[model samples]
Target: APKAPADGLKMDKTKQPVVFNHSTMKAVKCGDCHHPVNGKEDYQKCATAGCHDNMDKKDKSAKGYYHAMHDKGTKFKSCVGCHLETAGADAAKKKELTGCKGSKCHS
Candidate 1:
């Protein structure tokens, strides 16, 4: 299996440009955040050309990178969705993970 980047990955496609760190997400499986297409898993970056390349925050389609990570109502579990699940009734962790700004996600 390929190793994740040593430095945290920077998602610059969105206006907020959040950083993702595998170190902090040790409990998550690779398949949870990465979806396979057809019968194969390409393992390419999400924003790569034909994938979730759409940068528009308002584009709620699967192609929208913003929607892919933020949409809580989708069939797929997003960053926000999983974080909400993890946080549960803990208000402190919920605010840290789901806050719009000044949170670990966007800070």
Candidate 2:
């Protein structure tokens, strides 16, 4: 973890796992990130369904989805807003996501 700030403000660098397979992601179900079209996972269908689509933009200047969508020019805006809008506040907090630092969802 990064060293605590002078004021004693501590920061946690803990991260969530990335392996999204059944044998691995037991706590998370397919419905957690996919709708399981035809009883099977379909990346195309899942992507078009509007879950994690282009909610963010990207290019050279961009670092990740978050940076692309909410970089310096975007006020680093709403790192958690859209997430709360879709997944709700509780889920966002449970995820312990501090913006794009959630590398699993970023680059």
Candidate 3:
């Protein structure tokens, strides 16, 4: 696996478990959800890309991603406004997220 830059963010090297069959999932590509942030081969991708094309619109994935915690009828505008209410909180919280096993959202 490739190593992270001096900044400390690391790429997820482990292979994801095949959930939907290849035929069903259509062999989703990595770049579909990730974008290289640094090098041609290395960097971060925007995980929040499905609906929020720009910072101004609501992210459609938020409904599916946080169906449990999200308020009923309320819409998810921007992940940045709520999740990153404070500076550095987003990055710090991200570092703590190892996996979403057994989460109400995932399960």
Candidate 4:
């Protein structure tokens, strides 16, 4: 008889993306803030899925989401524009994001 495979390599489920409530706004799609997994299901592998998604402020990574999404030589726009960080930034800085009005992709 062939020996049984060893436990099939236990995968850590804690790192997977938790089912989030998109209605509350904070629990929207993980990719909204995080870089979607190219071909995997692990959440931690995502690029921008934490407090670092903010464009104005610097976090764990040297660059913020804005620079991560669309920087000097990239072709993308602000992620928060459509995601809406209303409860994110303070009242004072909330209105400051309005500058993202007509930013084109290649412009």
Which runs in model 4 stand beyond 4 Å of their true positions? 1-24, 45-65, 69-77, 83-107
- Candidate 3 residue-wise lDDT, 1-107, digit = tens: 53322332332322322121223223434332232334343223332455222332234444243331222343422222223333244554533321244421122
Q: Rate the local accuracy (lDDT) of all candidates.
A: 0.81, 0.36, 0.31, 0.36
lDDT of 2 by residue, 1-107 (tens): 22211332221222322222234334444344333446765434222433334433453232243342333343223334434444455655525433455533332
Better of 3 and 4 by TM-score: 4
Predicted candidate 1 versus true structure: per-residue lDDT over 1-107, tens digit per residue: 76767657787775678888888887877766666677665578898998889888899887898888877987768999888998999989988998777787877
Candidate 3 minimal-lDDT segment of 10 residues: 13-22
The 10 consecutive residues of candidate 2 with the worst lDDT sum are 4-13
TM-score of 1: 0.89
Candidate 4 residue-wise lDDT, 6-82, digit = tens: 33233222332122223344444444434334553334422345533444533325346435432333222243344
What TM-score against the true fold does each predicted structure earn?
0.89, 0.24, 0.19, 0.25
Instruction: Write down the RMSD of candidate 3 (Cα, Å).
Output: 15.2
Best by TM-score: 1
| Candidate that beats the other on TM-score, 2 or 3, i.e. the better one | 2
